[PDB]
């Protein structure tokens, strides 16, 4: 057991609003999600999308070359 | 003897008629479900 020194105040679940917090400070939530994860989203989407488009470009050139 | 002494000595009291019932109705007390936990592992006994 860890020795702990702390004071905790808690409110009853039936004395507070339950769902309205979902759509509170929404602009801040979106800004935090975008600004912290845009590098992570870039590192996942770019290799997948870039490789996919290169394959389609390769297939289109190969298909046209074999035509008469 | 107490009554005669009281009406002679208590003559400077305030005469404001504001009842305590009125004060209670103006600032009512209500119960809120909640809790406060003061965690101190150095105390030998728990008191709640």
From Swiss-Prot, chain A:
This is Cytochrome b-c1 complex subunit 8-1, mitochondrial. It comes from Arabidopsis thaliana (Mouse-ear cress). The chain crosses the membrane at residues 38-54. It holds the Pfam family Cyt_b-c1_8. Residues 55-68 are mitochondrial intermembrane. Component of the ubiquinol-cytochrome c oxidoreductase, a multisubunit transmembrane complex that is part of the mitochondrial electron transport chain which drives oxidative phosphorylation. The lineage of its organism: Eukaryota, Viridiplantae, Streptophyta, Embryophyta, Tracheophyta. PANTHER family: CYTOCHROME B-C1 COMPLEX SUBUNIT 8, CYTOCHROME B-C1 COMPLEX SUBUNIT 8-1, MITOCHONDRIAL. It is found in: Mitochondrion inner membrane. The gene is UCRQ-1. Residues 1-37 are mitochondrial matrix. Component of the ubiquinol-cytochrome c oxidoreductase (cytochrome b-c1 complex, complex III, CIII), a multisubunit enzyme composed of 10 subunits. The complex is composed of 3 respiratory subunits cytochrome b (MT-CYB), cytochrome c1 (CYC1-1 or CYC1-2) and Rieske protein (UCR1-1 or UCR1-2), 2 core protein subunits MPPalpha1 (or MPPalpha2) and MPPB, and 5 low-molecular weight protein subunits QCR7-1 (or QCR7-2), UCRQ-1 (or UCRQ-2), QCR9, UCRY and probably QCR6-1 (or QCR6-2). It comes from the Eukaryota. Its main location: mitochondrion. GO terms for cellular component: cytosol; mitochondrial inner membrane; mitochondrion; respiratory chain complex III. Keywords: Electron transport, Membrane, Mitochondrion, Mitochondrion inner membrane, Respiratory chain, Transmembrane, Transmembrane helix, Transport, Ubiquinone. Belongs to the UQCRQ/QCR8 family. It is a single-pass membrane protein.
UniProtKB/Swiss-Prot annotation, chain B:
It is found in: Mitochondrion; Mitochondrion inner membrane. It comes from the Eukaryota. Heterodimer of an alpha subunit and a beta subunit subunits, forming the mitochondrial processing protease (MPP) in which the alpha subunit is involved in substrate recognition and binding and the beta subunit is the catalytic subunit. Component of the ubiquinol-cytochrome c oxidoreductase (cytochrome b-c1 complex, complex III, CIII), a multisubunit enzyme composed of 10 subunits. Belongs to the peptidase M16 family. Catalytic subunit of the essential mitochondrial processing protease (MPP), which cleaves the mitochondrial sequence off newly imported precursors proteins. Preferentially, cleaves after an arginine at position P2. Component of the ubiquinol-cytochrome c oxidoreductase, a multisubunit transmembrane complex that is part of the mitochondrial electron transport chain which drives oxidative phosphorylation. This is Probable mitochondrial-processing peptidase subunit beta, mitochondrial. It comes from Arabidopsis thaliana (Mouse-ear cress). The chain holds residues 291 to 338 of 531 of the full protein.
């Amino acid at each position: 057991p860890v020795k702990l020194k702390a004071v905790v105040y808690a409110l009853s679940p039936f004395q507070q609003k339950i769902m309205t917090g979902l759509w509170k400070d929404l602009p801040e939530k979106i800004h935090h999600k975008v600004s912290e994860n845009w590098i992570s989203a870039t590192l996942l989407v770019t290799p997948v999308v870039g490789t996919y488009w290169y394959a389609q470009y390769f297939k289109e050139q190969e298909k046209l070359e074999h035509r008469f | 003897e107490v009554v005669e002494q009281v009406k002679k000595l208590f003559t400077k009291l305030s005469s404001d008629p504001t009842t305590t019932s009125q004060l209670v109705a103006n600032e009512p007390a209500s119960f809120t479900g909640s809790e406060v936990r003061m965690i101190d592992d150095d105390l030998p006994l728990a008191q709640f």
